[PDB]
Design a protein around this ligand. Sequence first.
Ligand code: NAG
Ligand code: NAG
Ligand code: CA
Ligand code: CA
Ligand code: CA
Ligand code: CA
Ligand code: CA
Ligand code: CA
Ligand code: CA
Ligand code: CA
Ligand code: CL
Ligand code: ZN
Ligand code: ZN
Ligand code: ZN
Lengths: 271, 264, 263, 396
Amino acid sequence: NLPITGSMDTAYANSTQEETFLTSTLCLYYPTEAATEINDNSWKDTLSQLFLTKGWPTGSVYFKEYTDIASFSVDPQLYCDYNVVLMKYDATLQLDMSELADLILNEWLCNPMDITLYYYQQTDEANKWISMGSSCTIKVCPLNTQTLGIGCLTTDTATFEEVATAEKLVITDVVDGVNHKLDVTTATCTIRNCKKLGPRENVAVIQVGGSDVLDITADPTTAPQTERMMRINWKKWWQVFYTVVDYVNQIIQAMSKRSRSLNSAAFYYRI
Amino acid sequence: QNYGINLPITGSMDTAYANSTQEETFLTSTLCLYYPTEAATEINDNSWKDTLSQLFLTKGWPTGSVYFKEYTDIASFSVDPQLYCDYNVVLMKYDATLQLDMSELADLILNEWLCNPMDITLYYYQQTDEANKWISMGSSCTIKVCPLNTQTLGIGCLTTDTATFEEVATAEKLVITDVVDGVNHKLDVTTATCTIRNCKKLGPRENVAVIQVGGSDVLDITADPTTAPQTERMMRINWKKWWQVFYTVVDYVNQIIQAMSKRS
Amino acid sequence: EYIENWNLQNRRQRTGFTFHKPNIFPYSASFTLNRSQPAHDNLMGTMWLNAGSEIQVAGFDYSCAINAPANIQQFEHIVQLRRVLTTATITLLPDAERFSFPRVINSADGATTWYFNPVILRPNNVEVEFLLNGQIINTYQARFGTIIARNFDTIRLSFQLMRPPNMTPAVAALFPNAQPFEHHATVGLTLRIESAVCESVLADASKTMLANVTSVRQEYAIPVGPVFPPGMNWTDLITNYSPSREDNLQRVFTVASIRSMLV
Amino acid sequence: MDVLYSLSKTLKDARDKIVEGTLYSNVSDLIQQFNQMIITMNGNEFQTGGIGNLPIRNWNFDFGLLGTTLLNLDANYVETARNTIDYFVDFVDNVCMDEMVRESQRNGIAPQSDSLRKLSGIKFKRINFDNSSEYIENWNLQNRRQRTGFTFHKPNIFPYSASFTLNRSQPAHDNLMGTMWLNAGSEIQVAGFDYSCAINAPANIQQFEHIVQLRRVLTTATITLLPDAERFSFPRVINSADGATTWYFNPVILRPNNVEVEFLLNGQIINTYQARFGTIIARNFDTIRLSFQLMRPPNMTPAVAALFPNAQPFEHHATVGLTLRIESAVCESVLADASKTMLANVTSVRQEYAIPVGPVFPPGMNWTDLITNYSPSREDNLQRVFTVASIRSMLV
Ligand SMILES: *[C@@H]1O[C@H](CO)[C@@H](O)[C@H](O)[C@H]1NC(C)=O
Ligand SMILES: *[C@@H]1O[C@H](CO)[C@@H](O)[C@H](O)[C@H]1NC(C)=O
Ligand SMILES: [Ca+2]
Ligand SMILES: [Ca+2]
Ligand SMILES: [Ca+2]
Ligand SMILES: [Ca+2]
Ligand SMILES: [Ca+2]
Ligand SMILES: [Ca+2]
Ligand SMILES: [Ca+2]
Ligand SMILES: [Ca+2]
Ligand SMILES: [Cl-]
Ligand SMILES: [Zn+2]
Ligand SMILES: [Zn+2]
Ligand SMILES: [Zn+2]
């Protein structure tokens, strides 16, 4: 990182929207019921041709399908330069969808949490415990300097306080500066000590139907709706895809290139 | 003053404020309340329109000007809703299952539209820009579309076979269709029961205020996903009785009118 | 200087008065709306303060020139100086700090108040024209800081709101494709005449002739006469600066300088 | 230059003092000086003009002397004097214009027009008398290699520069730390902005620095320092440094903390003021260093606490501004300022006659370019043309 000095008299460059569309890829994530209702085996081709009418080259818009919010939340691997997740709304899953958004709208620096040998804690408000798997049931036993438990016995898990049950993804936030013994099913879950670095600008979440319920910040005093969190009312999925295609320029203007240099080596759909 | 986009109007930042014009506008303006049949059902009083007119008179309106129009429900009210009052207030009952229909109705009545007739049998139709929409109304509106290419052949559809078309509306009473711009579309609609119009959203409708009774903020009067604006004419209240809803509308009628602009 | 100009004017020779910050513009805080409607929510126009030796103008578009051709909204402002200025040093600054904060402004006829919520953008294609008798004398394109207007009686400021073709998400949010518009794109301009030369007498920031004459007239309760406005108010005087007013005012200014030699 | 100035001063004194009815005792010395000027100039041929659209003009001096026997001046005497005065004023105006439009790189202090070079001859020094104006006095001091001094009300020392430096930036430009400034004329507005309000800063303090280099040394400078920057306190959409994109700025103004202004000369601290606002005196400096701090308020009201969250998004960006206005200063070099007119006169003459761009000054006499690259050669040429412009302003 170096200082950048700019002149406020500098002339605006021409639109780069065409070039970024030509040199980037767009990944769309939708629920399988969308494909069920559309009932057309060539609809990927149709959406690709419509996106070509919108500027994107053929073969740059990738369509990815997930069963539901709960399943998609197990290690979501976002591939393209720009990712748009069409997330169905359910009044019963307000937390989970939020968690999913909280997982994909932010960058996370995660390290393994070997609970069975080590005692863990959360240093600051950015530190969370992100647990993903088939069934994440997490119980917590707060501890203290004398190494005893507060309303929990380290030798008896039945006394561990309950914070997650049968979860595909859950973010656990406990009181900072306190050591907690953890009881989670390592067989059906993996828990990681994570820090949210900041917003993840290459991922937009469009909530299909419903109202504003997403809360991507653990702080109760903030429920910020960034430009990348859209929400559309719906009755047909074809209308949903038509609006995603038509306002694609608007959607991408709300997004920015990831810019984060990762330690990982994952697969990407890139040109 | 009117709508002088054509010609300039110059003003001085020292011009003294006139007095309140609220009384004069109430005296020269007709007020209409659009409420669902359920409201009249829960209000067993038959002379209740008279009482509401009297209460408005206590609030300044002359006793020939406040009007009350009933509609069965949102679906039926969305069929060619005619608003002929200087100030229109639509009390719109909220239902979680009809969110898109609430949004379509509010978009239709909270905005001005320039609509031209459509002939889905005689011509193909495309949408020019983000303002060009298709607005279909009637008893039942089932609309299917086949996007064409530059060669007029269909994309993921066959023009001859309507079954291969893509379905954007079923049995609707009102629907706003927004397709990808610049692409000719062959259309199939139930013209017997569905009139479709090629419409352009000119701008907000300033004399119509929708009070959403109960519920939350679900109205999305913009086809752009990135924007869900809440204009000052889109109000929301929490309710258990319709008499209290009407009393709230009457008592804060000054606040409701100052949130709207008189008919031009 | 004043007696020299008096003698020169008696002989019909070219006079010259050097003014630091001449009070050449009568106070006028006004606005023009080129696009408007009774709700005052999608407004395009200009608002300006001409005061003394300062012009502060600002062109505002509520739609941010979304529908304007080429995404450019052209704003123009004209100030007709009541006397010709020569050898004028003028500061240009891109922004108008006076029209960059939210304000509630009366309607042209005073019936209602409208709302202004500026978000300031760099003025584009800035063009200052200094004209004399309807002919262009000096032209400055995209020039800021000190400029020289050698001889002019009219200032024509043409500027543009150019919608930025690229926007970051925070920026892209503020300017939606359609109404409602909550952040109105404003382009400013500030013009400051620091020093000029005029063949006529004027008030300015460094002298005391006007203040001396006004003080003497107020101290002895001089009734209003048929030449000068009541109280020797400079705005009225310069607004209707007639040759008869110019002669009387030069006389009293010369006498005031002669008095200042001693008092 | 001194001879041209003396001609102009003699002509101005003659205009002001040779008036109807005045005692000859009032003008006797002036009459002697005027007749001496006639004697010196008589029989001398000059040519002005011939550059740009400035017309070639030929000047011939064959004049009679003024009478000396009157007790009081009458109308006849004044008209007789005025004819010669008019011709001489025309000549001096044309010489001044011919000099104002010319420049040289190596020897720009020396006269450039043929007429002024001829007037630099020894025989013309008889015209020379009282050199009392500030510009001619500084010209004579510079010729004698003495310390020079020009007083400027609001010196135009800072070239126009509206720029920003981002010390923390992202492609989405939403967690931005840096500063933006306008230097223009005698004004410097600076504003440091932190989008996170220094929540992650070590001691909740963000340090901002702004160094401005003056192209000439200023002395005896009265400056006003104010703790806010109105220029960077309203929302704006600003281009990016490359111009590719635009970012958003939504200031909320906090008072600057630990304000420290240093006036430096050759990198040495001459004057220093901490937490001092209003009028300060910088006695001798060439650099201004403004250091200020954004201190996160330890205690906040609910509205203030709502403005500044723990993490992103950041919608209200904390800003601390400083304003520095030089009202009066002294410089050893000529500078444009707000009260004088020499620059405007030189530019006006160069424009009215369509003078081609020369090898010294920037096109159009643009002050920003001149002061940005204020080289010694440019300073010499500028002092020459400014002295000539003042001499011209004595008459025209
Ligand atoms: C920018 O757009 C203009 C307008 O057509 C075009 O002439 C120009 O070549 C484009 N590119 C650049 C780099 O200016
Ligand atoms: C406005 O109100 C004032 C204050 O009572 C009253 O005197 C006046 O007549 C009213 N009407 C007008 C036109 O000013
Ligand atoms: Ca969960
Ligand atoms: Ca327990
Ligand atoms: Ca915690
Ligand atoms: Ca929260
Ligand atoms: Ca519908
Ligand atoms: Ca098909
Ligand atoms: Ca469309
Ligand atoms: Ca929308
Ligand atoms: Cl000043
Ligand atoms: Zn108006
Ligand atoms: Zn001053
Ligand atoms: Zn940048």
